[PDB]
Amino acid sequence: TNLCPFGEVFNATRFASVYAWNRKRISNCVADYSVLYNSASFSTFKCYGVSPTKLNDLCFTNVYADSFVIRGDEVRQIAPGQTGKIADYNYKLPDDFTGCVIAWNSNNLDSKVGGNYNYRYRLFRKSNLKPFERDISTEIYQAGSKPCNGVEGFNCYFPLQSYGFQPTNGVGYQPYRVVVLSFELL
């Protein structure tokens, strides 16, 4: 028995982009999940298939702590049965998802005067992602009938676009760090 290394996930200095969302695989450890839900730092805390207080009373093998950065108005897409650029092309949760979605505003960390363009998202994709699928490809998206041949332009767009995170952006356009906990339920 030992506490889960959740500090390394939530209190990480830098977060991965949503298209390359990082996954932390943790064994069946113990953690006061009731304290996490009762943390004032988390503005979004939605659980599916299980209550936040009854998380310790679950029987599972591995818990996955997926983490990434999206904007404010896209947090609604980190939920089962959602559509949009994030849910279809970046990070997709299954319909029978068992776990919780945690998010909080990170404007003070991920925004920079003049714009922070380090965080990216997949804008073009031929098909929707399967649940828990990750796509880091940088193939030039052929939106036209003519092949691109690794040359971008009209009808040939880079599938990834950078967020424009400025401190003066609206709250719907400010960066939000998201942590998704999933359980390989036994």
């Epitope: 650029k85 031929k126 929707n128 939106a143 036209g144 009938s145 609206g170 709250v171």
Partner: antibody, heavy 118, light 108 residues
Framework: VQLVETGGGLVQPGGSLRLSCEAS????????MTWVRQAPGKGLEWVSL???????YLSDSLKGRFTVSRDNSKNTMNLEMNSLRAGDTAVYYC?????????????WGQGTTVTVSS | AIQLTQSPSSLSASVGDRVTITCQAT??????LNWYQQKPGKAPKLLIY???NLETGVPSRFSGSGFGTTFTFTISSLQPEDIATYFC?????????FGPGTKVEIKR
């Protein structure tokens, strides 16, 4: 690029009409495609939008009656209009809107005239 | 729904003058407003995207500015071939709604 609308005309009220949108130079199945109508003498009004992964969206005044399908064999955009009303009489354009602020991406069609009257 | 208030509906002026069109959004759309130009009987053509970026091939006399809720569409020197109807459209909040429109005429 060339977008040509067809399948319009006149239809009795409450009838069904299928608008076609033949597309050259671009692949339909892998693009954001929108249908936008403009009533005679009125302004523009968004009708529908389809993502390059299938994800569709409709207006509130048209939800449950219009349907945007896509066809890769003919590279044609399709807009099926059921339960047509007098207020649906307008000119419909199929366009590939600019997504992500990429210049040169936006392109519109010629437009087709739909007349819903008896 | 985000209602766009584009004013005025008609600002007839002479060739060579300055044009100023204001568009207001009910909610916050950040910088994602597109300005389209529509000739009589023709399809709309994109002039300004992201409220401040000129499109490919568009003459430089056109310009845009503004973010959040209020946006401005400016023609540095009004021209003969610039006579059309101009709409503002937010495209990142479904349902995307156009402006009422501005019928640009000429005084002479």
């Amino acid at each position: 690029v060339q977008l040509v609308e067809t399948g319009g005309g006149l239809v009795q009220p409450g009838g069904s009409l299928r608008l076609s949108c033949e597309a050259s130079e671009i692949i339909v199945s892998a693009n954001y495609m929108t249908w936008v109508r403009q009533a005679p003498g009125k302004g523009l009004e968004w009708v529908s939008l389809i993502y390059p992964g299938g994800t569709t969206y409709l207006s509130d005044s048209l939800k449950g009656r219009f349907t945007v399908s896509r066809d890769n064999s003919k590279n044609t955009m399709n807009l099926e209009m059921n339960s047509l009303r007098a207020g649906d009489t307008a000119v419909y354009y199929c366009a590939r809107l600019i997504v992500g602020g990429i210049a040169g991406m936006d392109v519109w069609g010629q437009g087709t005239t739909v007349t819903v009257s008896s | 729904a985000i209602q766009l208030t584009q004013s005025p509906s008609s600002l007839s002026a002479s060739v060579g003058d300055r044009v100023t069109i204001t568009c207001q959004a009910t909610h916050d759309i950040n910088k994602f407003l597109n300005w389209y130009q529509q000739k009589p009987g023709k399809a709309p053509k994109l002039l300004i995207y992201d409220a401040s970026n000129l499109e490919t091939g568009v003459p430089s006399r056109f310009s845009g500015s503004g973010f959040g809720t209020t946006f401005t569409f400016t023609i540095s020197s009004l021209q003969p071939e610039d006579i059309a109807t101009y709409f503002c459209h937010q495209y990142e909040n479904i349902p995307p709604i156009f402006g009422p429109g501005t019928k640009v005429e000429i005084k002479r």
